[PDB]
Amino acid sequence: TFQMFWLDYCEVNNTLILFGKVKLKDDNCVSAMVQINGLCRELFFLPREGKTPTDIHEEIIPLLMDKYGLDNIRAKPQKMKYSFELPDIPSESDYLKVLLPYQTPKSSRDTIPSDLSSDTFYHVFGGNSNIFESFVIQNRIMGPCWLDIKGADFNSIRNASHCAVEVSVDKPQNITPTTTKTMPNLRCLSLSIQTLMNPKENKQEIVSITLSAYRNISLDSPIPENIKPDDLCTLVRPPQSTSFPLGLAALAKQKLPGRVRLFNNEKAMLSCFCAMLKVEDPDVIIGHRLQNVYLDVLAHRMHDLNIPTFSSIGRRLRRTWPEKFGRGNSNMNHFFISDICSGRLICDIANEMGQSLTPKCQSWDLSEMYQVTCEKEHKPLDIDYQNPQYQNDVNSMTMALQENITNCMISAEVSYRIQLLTLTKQLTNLAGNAWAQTLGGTRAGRNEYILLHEFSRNGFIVPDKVFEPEKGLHKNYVLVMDFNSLYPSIIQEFNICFTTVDRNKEDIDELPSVPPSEVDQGVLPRLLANLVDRRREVKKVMKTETDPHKRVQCDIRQQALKLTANSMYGCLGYVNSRFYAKPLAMLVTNKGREILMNTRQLAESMNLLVVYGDTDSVMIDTGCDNYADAIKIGLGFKRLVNERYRLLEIDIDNVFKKLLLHAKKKYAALTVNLDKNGNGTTVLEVKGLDMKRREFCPLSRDVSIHVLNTILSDKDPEEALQEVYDYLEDIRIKVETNNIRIDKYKINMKLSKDPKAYPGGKNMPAVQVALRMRKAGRVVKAGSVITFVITKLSVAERAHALNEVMIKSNNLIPDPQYYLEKQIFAPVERLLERIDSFNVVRLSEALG
DNA sequence: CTGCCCGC
RNA sequence: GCGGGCAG
């Protein structure tokens, strides 16, 4: 027998590889891979009126043996239920289950179409089945867990992976899941990458890399705060020259923690990186903005510099990159990188998943995340290796390397503090998908698997793959109430399911009816009910639980259950979902409208005013100027709603001391965050305003921020607006005299298309700046971000690349007219558009 | 993804 | 219709 706790997988040559950890005689855990052969697609042939599974068996099997070239094909009758959107297919029938291996001698890449109409059957399910999905469903594997693996061949596989152990199995049935709740220790490696931009080719090159190793991260117990690394090492190449100044190593050992290794070029550094990575052999790679920034760069540099050992970024061994790698397809390239990493979990704290756990963040900049989550201060150093100081200034280089090290250590500590690993693991076990997927931030991922496992276990055949805002300033405390669990409660209350709702599968636009009380509880609602109950048990345990450790763990558990339940709707509601059902989505939505309407009435019944509302949340003005009084109002509203809808549990999600609402998802506000000792603190929060777009410069953002701060202040409104005009006048003077850093005038704009391919590009400053670069010699293709400054004739014509403008000798000063008008005036005119005693004349005069 | 603003 | 973005 062979025991492995599996973490990740990858598909290759119609086989399935699992990467995981194995315990050794000395209880030591090492990496391992298991190649799984003998996997088959389960196809289900639906007999025609008056036919049997044997009628099919005789017909197609001989035909299948020929095409695919098999001696014998396992097939058997099996009674299955069908309750999805395909018309004319019956609720229940006898099907012919055919086990068609993925690996065939002939035409292994030719799939059987679903419309295979014969005189025996008329339909076939499981034709395009994915290999990982097949393994996981058939063996009932629910996310990362311990697996008992029998008949493991230790002499078949050689040099297939970067793992310590390589084995294979002849059949998937050799692998069975265990009940063990515990898991082995993980090997985490925090990465921090410092880059440099070459303006010639528009290529972000790597200057340094920090590697911090934490070889024993146990998710079965809380991770100690400010955990110390087992090893710290930094690799660095010279950003300008071919050699570092002498004595650099002596100063590094003196001032910098961990090992420091200096290289003569980027290629040698990255080769060393790959080798160190292979030896370290981490289970998890932690970082900040790895997924869509630094990981892409790293891969592309390894590609560019022809690094042969690049594949150690994952756990699968490859001699060559994918053929279509670097075809300029920023979309497909991402897939290739994720695939190459297979075997190592990417723990990005600043990705879609990570952001969700740090809602109190606004920018999600590393320093910001560290402050918010750990309540510790770090002043970010802006390192620009193009600066000449770095070539000969050993202390400058040392300061930059220290900055990189700090950032690496910060990324790891944050990832542990927000408990990203534990939560995503829980979510994976609940949905039964791949951990890798969860850590990524997909929507059709944990919502499709959770359903395939529930329905497959219950013998079902699965499918093949608002209130106008009250615009203005709100002086009284506004509470954001979260109705995330609106839909799940609706699906559970009315018993909405694919199995319970009689609907017209010909006309999906036809509204169906809720099932009668007589109908038994459906599959979907039963699953929902189970999740809700489990969540209840956890909270009950929390009231009693005394251990801070066990307590926190319980909090994570319930969060996972909540997120899983609140993601069930997307399954049937979002159009490109595997389980999409328009009649069911509509049915749920209308009940959601009734519930919300009554909700509005309830708020008004409490003399409250709904400032804004939608299916996700409803913001209510409490009419109070006190945190306490506002909270009492909010709790009364929560209770009131639950009495009307006992399965609908809303809660207070966000407290706004003040709220300037501008549009549906466009507002600024002062959120109140309570501390440990009850202490309350105010913080600015912005969504959707001009101050959040790329097209507005840091100066414009700075003006917007200060203006808001003063307006949402408690000081009298005329003094506030007067302070605003007095601020703008001063800014105006500073702009005209050009006494503001040029960096603050920079404007970014992404070109999804090629610079040349733009109809009205002759008016677009970004496009013009891009084209001038090609003529100048600089490289610029689709997917490029253009940074420019408008100079002092046409606006687009006066636009120039920031870096060009940065050279003080070019005599390119920013155009005051433009920045005061389009970057300072307009945005403020919108921010204060609906504020009492606001006068556009005062503003324009304080400007021009 | 999915809807939702802005701009020719 | 094409771009450009926001937000969950």
Numbering used by the authors: 351 to 815, 848 to 1174, 1187 to 1242
Excerpt from the paper describing this PDB structure:
The eukaryotic primase is a heterodimer of catalytic and regulatory subunits that is associated with the catalytic subunit of Pol α and its accessory B subunit in a constitutive heterotetrameric assembly, the Pol α/primase complex. In contrast, the Pol α/primase complex produces longer, composite RNA-DNA primers that result from the concerted enzymatic activities of primase and Pol α. We have determined crystal structures of the catalytic core (349–1258; 910 amino acids) of yeast Pol α in unliganded form (apo), bound to an RNA primer/DNA template duplex (binary complex) and in a productive complex with RNA primer/DNA template and incoming dGTP (ternary complex). The catalytic region of Pol α adopts the universal ‘right-hand' DNA polymerase fold consisting of a palm domain harboring the active site, a fingers domain that interacts with the incoming nucleotide and a thumb domain that grips the primer-template duplex.
